[PDB]
Amino acid sequence: MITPRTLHTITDDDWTRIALLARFAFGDIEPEQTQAAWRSMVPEDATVVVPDETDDAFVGQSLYLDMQLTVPGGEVLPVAGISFVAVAPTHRRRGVLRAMYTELHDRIARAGYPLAVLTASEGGIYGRFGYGVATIEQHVSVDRRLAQFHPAAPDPGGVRMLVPADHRDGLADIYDRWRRRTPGGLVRPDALWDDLLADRPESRRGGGELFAFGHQDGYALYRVDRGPDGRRSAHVVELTAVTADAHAALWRALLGLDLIDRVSIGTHPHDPLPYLLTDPRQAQVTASADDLWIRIMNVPAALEARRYQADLDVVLDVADGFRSDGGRFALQISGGRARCTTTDAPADIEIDLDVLGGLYLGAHRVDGFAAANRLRSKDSELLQQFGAAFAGDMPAELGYGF
Amino acid sequence: MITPRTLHTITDDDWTRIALLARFAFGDIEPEQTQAAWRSMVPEDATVVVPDETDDAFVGQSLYLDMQLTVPGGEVLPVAGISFVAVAPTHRRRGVLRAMYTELHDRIARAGYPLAVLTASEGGIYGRFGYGVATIEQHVSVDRRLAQFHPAAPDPGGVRMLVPADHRDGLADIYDRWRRRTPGGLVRPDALWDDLLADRPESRRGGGELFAFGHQDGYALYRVDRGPDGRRSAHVVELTAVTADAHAALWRALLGLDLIDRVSIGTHPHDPLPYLLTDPRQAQVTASADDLWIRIMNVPAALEARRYQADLDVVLDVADGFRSDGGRFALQISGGRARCTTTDAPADIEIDLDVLGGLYLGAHRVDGFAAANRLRSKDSELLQQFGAAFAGDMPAELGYGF
């Protein structure tokens, strides 16, 4: 009783049927405008579902969004943004997920995309299907009362107080400038902008209505919120800056607010904030989570489209235990650019598709993977070269979650 | 108007004074015998104090340890380790601290040391003097019952259950082989060993009673504790491993304790553990914090000491605002080795000595300091090269605190 039919387009009864299943698997009723916004991002032939005994509702679902992701060196690639994946609580353990994934990857594949990307949702299983953790989110916390900036620290001022809803075109532009300069940057449709700034109480979790700071080269969205204390603290929801001074002047404004005791952000790994303060201990790094996951769908494409931090000439055997996207490729990186030729010479390096996925925005070291035999070579030193080559120019940051 | 006094040698009465201040200053301190080992490690003319208006106990105290740190590429350097620094709460008011630091650091240079090192005390100002954070601890924490090793991951066995005090010599040179390999490695006199494996109730601190896992190329000391819940959790006091075989093996043993709920450790930034499991989410990285602070006491000595990761030719002006260990240097790095001579040439890159110290073990990135003007160049990729070169290839781990 398992066959998946790929929706050519998402009718209003299909979406209703999907927002039912999705509601069970993900929690709240993301509001009408938020999902419509999401629905608008779905290329056609991009929704694989599995119906029930009587085709009244769905008992499995998936889809990818049509996205454009920046990779190191600056190129944008179109990526397939896998999401709204759910199998009914009732039908699990009967292999619905796998069936539906194969069909969605053959659709993702035929539709052209070089990379597939997701965020991890609880209970998901991703490694064996070839997805690796590509970016890291690091929650960092500053007690504003004791933080005090370093002498050398920039102090560019020129930060306006903003109503975010009134500067859609303004913000969205700042974001775009950063997007083009930062790996992990997704393009964000006017749809989502419209929907973010709206400040739906629903999507709202973690504070009240939305405050915003503005700079010619950056902006910051944050919410205030009280604890059991009475004592409030600020949570930064997005802080996007395109110049160092943007970034600095914003952090300066943020620790400006006398109302609040702490400010926390969910940032990327090497954020400059601590180095801005006289003493790094004043900023308090308190978690490191996975953010963006990545299945490389077409090796040569993906590997050539990005730039490299060291030079390397090697044959690379990619294991793929789900599809046939691997094989042996000849990686040849010359002045930080690659030419990734299909081969059947012997290999220098064996790598599982999920770990090629992960290295890819330069967020990892071969150290963990190698020591875990997901990254093999008779030649210890070459494997260090490989990692250096794949290391990132700039710290990856996913633009937004999906 | 206050002059400090260098003690040619620390007497029983001195030490009593020193112990008394350091108790008020650091909290009811180590046992008598731990104190005895630290004392053991203080060379001559290495103690600076500000005597009380009449000498009973001191108003100000500082000394340094004779130590031996490992730098990248395995060279070992003698380093001065600034410990038991403290100003009696009754004189934190009047500039005692700078007085001692000036004298103590004078002493440290008269003695030859290329580096001064310390771990941070609450209340200490540090970069002012040229100490920068040079290594990092991530607090990783795995939920045993849900963790799961990767199918790929090595399962070498080789683990012996241990009573720790009973293989003091064995453990001790596993740790040496490690020390010799890892940047950050402090030598560890047997005085310190016998103190730790003595496993004293006061110096137990956070948990129950040391357990040990032994292995031909690694050990793991841990303590179990249970809190209000009724449920236990292991905390790893130290895990030293020389092979990735030792490490996997040790970690397999660790996540084998049915007794245990979570297993916490305090380790370096790019630890194999999460890569060893099927889903990097099973391991939960929580907090990242400073470990080891460095002040470079002799730029050419220390710069020539380690090895590097790109080539580099640059003239470096190094800004010290405490002593005069500053100045313009030719930094010439090829094939890893560096030649660093003093010069009158115009500088390509300015750098503040406290950030030169931080970068010294390969720990950070340039982006942060650059962003804050603690590191400048009109050429923006000269910087990117400089950084690229100072980077490490073994994550730096401070050997123990002091």
Add this chain to the structure above:
Amino acid sequence: MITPRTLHTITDDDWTRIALLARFAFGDIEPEQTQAAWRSMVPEDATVVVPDETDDAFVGQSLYLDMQLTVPGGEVLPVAGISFVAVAPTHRRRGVLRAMYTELHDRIARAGYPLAVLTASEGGIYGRFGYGVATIEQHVSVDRRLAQFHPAAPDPGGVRMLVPADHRDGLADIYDRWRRRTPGGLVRPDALWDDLLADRPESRRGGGELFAFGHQDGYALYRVDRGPDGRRSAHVVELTAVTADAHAALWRALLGLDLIDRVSIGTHPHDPLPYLLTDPRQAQVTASADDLWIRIMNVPAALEARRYQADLDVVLDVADGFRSDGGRFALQISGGRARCTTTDAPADIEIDLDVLGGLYLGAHRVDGFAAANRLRSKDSELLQQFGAAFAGDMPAELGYGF
């Protein structure tokens, strides 16, 4: 080089700038018709703001409300209620505050107000400007199920349960009766009652709709809420009694609710609630925090207005390091009343202006101040006599906060 600017009258696109600033600066934006009411209370030429270089929103703002304060002895003085003072977290450190406070106080002075009053908010630098804490607020928690009145203790009854809104006038009259009897007493404009009984969800925390109790001489507003447990307790929001029996009878009421585990109230220091029980231990006193602060603007005006508890023939040297309302005064107090007149004699007692302020409503002892050398006299008993004089019969208590 900043010149501030007085708004002779508040515009609509003036009130817009002010709310926006205020929202950035005090957490939430209180409901519209809350703002409407306050703004209703701002007299002419009583708003001081600082425009941006652009002059689009405000980067500094402050204003006073014209009010009506009761002092020891029942006299009622007009008082500048300093409110909404706020500085954009962007132009911080630019000392706009001194620029504004200095104009806003010239205004207050021109207007002829004897006192200025405020409630404190985070970051507020207040003593520095001659403000002093003038009333104290004790929080109290009775656990109903073990509480029980004393045998001797009044049981008048006469408490109706009310719906708050419907007896707006009735409430208002009762309040007013209290006000004229109780130093601390602010007049409450009808605008404000309306907004109070209105009970909009947005400035309710913590609890639900607003329950109430009505005695001929007293009333009690409160909210109930489920906490974590989730067991319920009642926050008394405001309880006003003119006679001991309304006090008794209302407390009786409050403690007879059943949902309730405990009843909590913020109230003044010598509240007879605990004296009303068989054991004061039933009535847990939780905190003691600042409420109303006072800056004496016209020393003679203000001193003369109230009346006193001891006699006193002393020469006062009020010290003011912000403005110039200092000087030496012959303060002679005979049987209640004081004639304070400016003079040239040397001093007996010297006294910082912020101290005179806090001492004004009686709720301090001179001991603390004297110890700090904020209250200096060479004559030891003179000081203790000053205290004697400035004490008061009715415990001071602010009417409501702003």
Add this chain to the structure above:
Amino acid sequence: MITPRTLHTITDDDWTRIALLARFAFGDIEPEQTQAAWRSMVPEDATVVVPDETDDAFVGQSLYLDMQLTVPGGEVLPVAGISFVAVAPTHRRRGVLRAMYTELHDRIARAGYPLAVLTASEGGIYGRFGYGVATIEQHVSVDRRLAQFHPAAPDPGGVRMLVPADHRDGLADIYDRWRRRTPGGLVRPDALWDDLLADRPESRRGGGELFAFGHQDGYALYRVDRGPDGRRSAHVVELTAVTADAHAALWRALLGLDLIDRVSIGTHPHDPLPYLLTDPRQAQVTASADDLWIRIMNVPAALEARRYQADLDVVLDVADGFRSDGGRFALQISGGRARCTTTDAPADIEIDLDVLGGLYLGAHRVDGFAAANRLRSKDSELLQQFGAAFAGDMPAELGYGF
């Protein structure tokens, strides 16, 4: 059934009976040396027990310690400190406690004591027996990191660190100088001093070993304590200060412990500590609670021993539902000194014996009692004159627990 007998002295076998019953009723068995300390204090014919059927153990116990309370004006009286009151939880609800108290209070009365005193515990019924709350213990905490002393504030200097053990005499001497100035000052026998510095761990509340700060005119005693999250608060157990400076100097000391995030203390109502800080808000009053309770045994003797702050000539009717120590009394106060003789004329103020005991150290304001009818007079300004007379120059602080 119940017939209490009054031990002439305590024999070693009698003490074990009491230590037995005490453990059941109080939990920790105070170390041997503690118990001896108290035994030391128990005078002749001062122990009252009820034995059980076999006459092997006791099923009800009580005694009083011979003590020395300091009352207003600085005169010391001998007071009977009721201690160690127990009833076997087996024989509770049989009237054991009233029986025991009645005889204990003749012993006290016939002994010649004008005051019984105790620190309340458990349940703890105390009102009816004539005991009222006499002194108050307000808990204060200071976030050390944020607190600043007011510029005006003494910085007297003069504080040393100590091993408090090695300074018992000079400590006790300072304590003595304080005890004779402060109402509530108990005399502290060497035995007790010896037991406090004994620092035994099974009587150690609020931290680890004892720290000391000594001044010639005061000392602070505190423990340090580490929270779940590894940050230390330091809790003062005793801060005895004989002059203003010593008080300033010691706080100035305490707040200078970089180790410590907050300091806390259980102190008296009007301590100067918040007044010493530039903003009183950095100090936080966090509880207010009963300390010492008092029963007046002999009204005339007691009222004559203390001094007063006003004058009055009144007939005082003292209620008493447990003994007949009440009566009507001519109370005339002038010069702050009172003569009090029995009189048969008719009364102006009728007073419960609770509230005379409670009002005795000048703690309370009479408004509370009067509202609750435990204090009564027609003439409403007579109550007011009574209270005014009964207030106290020095804030009262119990010397130590018992």
